[PDB]
Write a protein that binds this DNA or RNA. Structure first.
Lengths: 555, 411
DNA sequence: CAGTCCCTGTTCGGGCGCCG
DNA sequence: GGTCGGCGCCCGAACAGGGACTG
């Protein structure tokens, strides 16, 4: 076997482990013909070699169809080898998005074929890549080969290829610094601001620089004129768009169908603004079977029709211009949903997106807006390496009131206010000092761990009082219920004294939405008030009416 | 031609495997120029994906510094090599460094590039440089000399460091010199003028051996933040309720605190804004509790085997309080910081500055970096904290959300 | 006193989409 | 078909750690 021009990568097994020894699957006769047709061809090209009984290792093998081609792809079920092979550090840190591309004069896209088969494997490691090819007869022993080049299906093949490919491109990039080469697996995006004449010279220079190491750049996959098909997009000299997205039109929807639909919608939300998957993801909660049929809710059918109407119109993004500033604008879309657009000139979106996580049982719009800005900032530094200026639907004074009074450290980068309703605002403000002339409520609640029963009430300075029996509750729910009673039976200005750190810790965060219905009712009563002052006193210390109300709700 | 000091991990642990986080453009350009130059000087060499270890890397600028500085987050590696720099080659901590009139920090990290690293340990010093928009896969390197920011580097260089400092320690026996990480702390009781002069003497004394910084400290002017009670003339029900809760919370530190007579004033179900006159037994109980808060806590002392823990509280208006301890309610030092950079405009900058000021004081007093309990959400902190870091070391931290209760540390 | 129940948050894993 | 790796999302299960009460 001749020596490949590329340097091999030394690969070891994990210490104290031997190679794989697993039996071959029964294969269909149509896949057997495709395998023997490829195994005999790769053997002629010096990519796999015959082995005898001295190789005690074996692993299954199969084949799947290639997309839009009569050719087949050979894959190895290395699930047992991957367990005992050494761990690798993947060098593919992420995804190349077209929104980060800069406008270049000339663009060239090319894809090398059978790239895993053009990079050699470590010599001492080839013995463990032994597999059997079953013949058309089950009694025929079969031909046993071993890989001399990156096997498709091994957990180290992509990590080794991506690092070996970058080492080959370094001498060309070092000699040609002004050439931009986007390297993702076996696809090379080559662009330059050089004249269209000197561009193809460097293109052929690279196709020969890659040819010196056994990498073939076929003219079939060669692309010289726009639109270029790169990473599943359509690149034009001025705009870009995703390749056509097709959503299923099932009359009977299963869980699998919904999952596929949501995934395609997430893919589309990158340029298609306004995609909502809230009500469709509400169909995936609490479900157990992937093939279980689920009927669409009225809120889910409306959300699907809206997303179908958005996908009808053609949308397109632009390319990054490093000369002008980066701008990101957010809108509140739905309760828990957010959308954003990143651009440099108005209505010329570089890319869009959405954020909708529900973090915590209790939260407000200001918290969710801060989470979205952080999700955008990280996404922007990935693609453009800088923090964009923000246009947020929150008043400058609204945010100033929030972060200065909040006990946690919170901050938003350079941003300006945009008057696009709905505007994010704080729905109620807790007073810092007790209200003069306002009725003072001393509240407390208690329950029994066994009976799940308890009381909740209050005692005021004007003699007002109330105690309510509660069934199937906890100690925390009663102390919240005692506050809800004080808010119901009080005027517009009220002072409330509690001893529950749990209840006080939720309300002071100024939430406007909650997973608990009791909290939402407390929020609703807080919005109706004009002045509300909360205060905490230690329980069981004989403090004011807090000890009087602790004894009333004792049982 | 120097012999390598053999280093091993702590038994039963593998190297660090921490992913690299995205970096801005001004940081990636700073790392490319430095890694290319360091590779040209043989300090580092490119590696491949066969190395399963990795450590995050980013760049910083020190206070009033224009040049970028390469920084590696060896925290995960330092945790997995802890028995080396504490048992075999430990550095003693001078107790008089905190008593000097002036202490100056010097970045001596450039000297570690002169000593080669153990060949078997270079596998764990691996890191990766990211690219903008993932233009290229990760460009990986590994250290071939003593890396900056590794706790094993000053332990190996300690023998070489003492011999360089001996001619200067003999000429100046009253000057205290301590070494922690890539920094050198020099403290003296000299006047500020001749103090900076002796610094330049050591700067040239280190340049002749193959090694420029100026940050000054004044540990003798460090103050603590005691627990204070309000000196109100007219006390309302709400004022006494807040006073009782604060005194009740302070009773966990000072066992002599009593709230029996003050609770007797809160017997009736009175309105919060109603004024309550302090009884004679309550005025004495309030005066005695003020005196107990003046006393130091009984039984508090530093344990060298225990880890330091620091809690920070945001008190608004640019005010930040902190407490350092090893056992709960046994606080070794309290304090308060105000008007730091980013006051009234950025909390993350103030919190980043506060962690630095606290960690610096912990190195001067005990020679350890505490683990921080940061009053911030994780995602908020992990997004912006690198934009304001100006130190060569990185302490450990966790994220807490303890809503306030009563304000124990600030009035 | 240690041991729970309650509550809330984080981490992880398992699906789907996309790319090569 | 039931290969690998990268990235994203959404959900639940599992785990974690603090607070109030009880033998």
């Amino acid at each position: 076997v001749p020596i490949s021009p590329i340097e091999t990568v030394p690969v070891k097994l994990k210490p104290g482990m031997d190679g794989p020894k697993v039996k071959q699957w029964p294969l269909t006769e149509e896949k057997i013909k495709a395998l023997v047709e490829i195994c005999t061809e790769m053997e002629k090209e010096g990519k796999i070699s015959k082995i005898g009984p001295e190789n005690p290792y074996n692993t299954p093998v199969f084949a799947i169809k290639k997309k839009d081609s009569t050719k087949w792809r050979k894959l190895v079920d290395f699930r047992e080898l991957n367990k005992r092979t050494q761990d690798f550090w993947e060098v593919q840190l992420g995804i190349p998005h077209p929104a980060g591309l800069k406008k270049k004069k000339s663009v060239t896209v090319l894809d090398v074929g059978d790239a895993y088969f053009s990079v050699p494997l470590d010599e001492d490691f080839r013995k463990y890549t032994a597999f059997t090819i079953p013949s058309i007869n089950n009694e025929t022993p079969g031909i046993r080969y071993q890989y001399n080049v990156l096997p498709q299906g091994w957990k180290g093949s992509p990590a080794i290829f991506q690092s070996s490919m970058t080492k080959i491109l370094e001498p060309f990039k070092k000699q040609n610094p002004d050439i931009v080469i986007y390297q993702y697996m076996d696809d090379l995006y080559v662009g330059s601001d050089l004249e269209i004449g000197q561009h193809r010279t460097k293109i052929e220079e690279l196709r020969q620089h890659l040819l010196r190491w056994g990498l073939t750049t076929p003219d079939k996959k060669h692309q010289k004129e726009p639109p270029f098909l790169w990473m599943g997009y359509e690149l034009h000299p001025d705009k870009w768009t995703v390749q056509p997205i097709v959503l299923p039109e099932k009359d009977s929807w299963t869980v699998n169908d919904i999952c596929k639909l949501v995934g395609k919608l997430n893919w589309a939300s990158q340029i298609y603004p306004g995609i909502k998957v809230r009500q469709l993801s509400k169909l995936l909660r609490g479900t157990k079977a992937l093939t279980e049929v689920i009927p669409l809710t009225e809120e889910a059918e409306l959300e699907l029709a809206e997303n179908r109407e958005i996908l009808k119109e053609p949308v397109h993004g632009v390319y990054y211009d490093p000369s002008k500033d980066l701008i990101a604008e957010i809108q509140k879309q739905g309760q828990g949903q957010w959308t954003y657009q990143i651009y440099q000139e108005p209505f010329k979106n570089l890319k869009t997106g959405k954020y909708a996580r529900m973090r915590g049982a209790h939260t407000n719009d200001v918290k969710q807006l801060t989470e979205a800005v952080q999700k955008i900032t990280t996404e922007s530094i990935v693609i453009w390496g800088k923090t964009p200026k923000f246009k947020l639907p929150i008043q400058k004074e609204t945010w100033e009131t929030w972060w200065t009074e909040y006990w946690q450290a919170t901050w938003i980068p350079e941003w300006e206010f945009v008057n696009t309703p709905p505007l994010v605002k704080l729905w109620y403000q807790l007073e810092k000092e007790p209200i003069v002339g306002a009725e003072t409520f001393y509240v407390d609640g208690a329950a029994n761990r066994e009976t799940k029963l308890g009381k909740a009430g209050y005692v005021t300075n004007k003699g007002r009082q109330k105690v309510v029996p509660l069934t199937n509750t906890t100690n925390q729910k009663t102390e919240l219920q005692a506050i809800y009673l004080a808010l119901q039976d009080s005027g517009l200005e009220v002072n409330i004294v509690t001893n529950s750190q749990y209840a006080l810790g939720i309300i002071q965060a100024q939430p406007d939405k909650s997973e608990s219905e009791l909290v939402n009712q407390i929020i609703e009563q807080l919005i109706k008030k004009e002045k509300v002052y909360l205060a905490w006193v230690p329980a069981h210390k004989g403090i004011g009416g807090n000890e009087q109300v602790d004894k009333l709700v004792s049982a | 031609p120097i012999e390598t000091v053999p280093v091993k991990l702590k038994p039963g642990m593998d190297g660090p495997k921490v992913k690299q986080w995205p970096l801005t453009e001004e940081k990636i350009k700073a790392l490319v120029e430095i890694c290319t130059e360091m590779e040209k000087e043989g300090k580092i060499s490119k590696i491949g994906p066969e190395n399963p270890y990795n450590t995050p890397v980013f760049a910083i600028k020190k206070k009033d510094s224009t040049k970028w500085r390469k920084l590696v987050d060896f925290r995960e590696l330092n945790k997995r090599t802890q028995d080396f720099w504490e048992v075999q080659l430990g550095i003693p901590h001078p107790a008089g460094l905190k008593k000097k009139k002036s202490v100056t920090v010097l970045d001596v990290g450039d000297a570690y590039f002169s000593v080669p690293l153990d060949e078997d340990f270079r596998k764990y010093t691996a890191f990766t440089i990211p690219s903008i928009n993932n233009e290229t896969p990760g460009i990986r390197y590994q250290y071939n000399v003593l890396p900056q920011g590794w706790k094993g580097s000053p332990a190996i260089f300690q023998s070489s460091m003492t011999k360089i400092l001996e001619p200067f320690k003999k000429q100046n026996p009253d000057i205290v010199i301590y070494q922690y990480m890539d920094d050198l702390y020099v403290g003296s009781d000299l006047e500020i003028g001749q103090h900076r002069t002796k610094i330049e003497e050591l700067r040239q004394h280190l340049l002749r051996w193959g090694l420029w910084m100026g940050y000054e400290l004044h540990p003798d002017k460090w103050t603590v933040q005691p627990i204070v009670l309000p000196e109100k003339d007219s006390w309302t029900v709400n004022d006494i309720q807040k006073l009782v809760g604060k005194l009740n919370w302070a009773s966990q530190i000072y066992p002599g605190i009593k709230v029996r007579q003050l609770s007797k004033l809160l017997r009736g179900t009175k309105a919060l804004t109603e004024v309550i006159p302090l009884t004679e037994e309550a005025e004495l109980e309030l005066a005695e509790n003020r005196e107990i808060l003046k006393e130091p806590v009984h039984g508090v002392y530093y344990d060298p085997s225990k880890d330091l823990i620091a809690e920070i509280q945001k008190q608004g208006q640019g005010q930040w309080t902190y407490q350092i301890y090893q056992e709960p309610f046994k606080n070794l030092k309290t304090g308060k910081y105000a008007r730091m950079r980013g006051a009234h405009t950025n909390d993350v900058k103030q919190l980043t500055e506060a962690v630095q000021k606290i960690t610096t004081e912990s190195i001067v007093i005990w020679g350890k970096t505490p683990k921080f309990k940061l009053p911030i959400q994780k995602e908020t902190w992990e997004t912006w904290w690198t934009e304001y870091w100006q130190a060569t070391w990185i302490p450990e931290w966790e994220f807490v959300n303890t809503p306030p209760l009563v304000k124990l540390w600030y009035q």
